[PDB]
Design a binder for this molecule. Structure first.
Ligand SMILES: [Zn+2]
Ligand SMILES: [Zn+2]
Length: 220
């Protein structure tokens, strides 16, 4: 089940019961899709990452709140990049709690973005209604602050930008990346979660554990 906006720049696809994937196309150098999650809980909507900017983020929020007729209460920022923290301003003005590690908050500030909470520790478990969410900082990789999100009830891993999609042959922006450490961080994810079912890459189609292996291959 996929749902879009008249424009086709924002779409949400059902992964499981209360887990949907939101994807927005940014307009640069042209369309680059970015993934996030929408968690439909008994106490509101929880998102994993916002969008490229405030306009897209606001549109995304308006779309899901209308679809599920609920308030987006929290958002987990996986790292300080436009495709993830781009709509932080929209979040703060709507009373949406922007969770992040202290490091992500520090880098967000350094990059001219409003500051997220900086509340997430290396391992943080959050439960919204009956929806369980675990955030984990595996170490430096795509960026210094990148974290992954794990949904234990579904064994779904949001690898975010630390994980490349099956068709990706490029690592993307590595100016802020720690290429040599990237591999170790992915192994920490692989060692921590040994029963991964679905894996959501930062960009591209949902896959499985093979995406992490594919990324390690690109890094060799
Ligand atoms: Zn990034
Ligand atoms: Zn990205």
């Amino acid at each position: 089940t996929v749902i879009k906006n008249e424009t086709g720049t924002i779409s949400i696809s059902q992964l499981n019961k209360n887990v949907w994937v939101h994807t927005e196309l940014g307009s640069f150098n042209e369309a680059v899709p970015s993934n996030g999650l929408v968690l439909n809980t008994s106490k509101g909507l929880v998102l994993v990452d916002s969008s490229w900017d405030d306009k897209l983020t606001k549109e995304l929020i308006e779309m899901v709140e209308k679809k599920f007729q609920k308030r987006v209460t929290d958002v987990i920022i996986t790292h300080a990049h436009a495709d993830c923290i781009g709509g932080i301003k929209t979040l703060k003005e709507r009373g949406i709690k922007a969770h992040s590690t202290a490091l992500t908050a520090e880098l967000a500030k350094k990059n001219g973005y409003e500051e997220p909470l900086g509340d997430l520790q290396t391992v943080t478990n959050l439960k919204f209604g009956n929806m369980k969410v675990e955030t984990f900082y595996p170490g430096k990789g795509h960026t210094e602050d990148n974290i992954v999100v794990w949904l234990p009830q579904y064994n779904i891993l949001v690898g975010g930008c630390l994980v490349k999609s099956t068709s990706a042959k490029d690592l993307g922006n590595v100016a802020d990346a720690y290429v040599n450490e990237w591999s170790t961080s992915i192994e920490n994810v692989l060692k921590r979660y040994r029963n991964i079912n679905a894996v959501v890459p930062g960009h591209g189609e949902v896959g499985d554990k093979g995406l992490l292996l594919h990324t390690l291959d690109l890094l060799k």
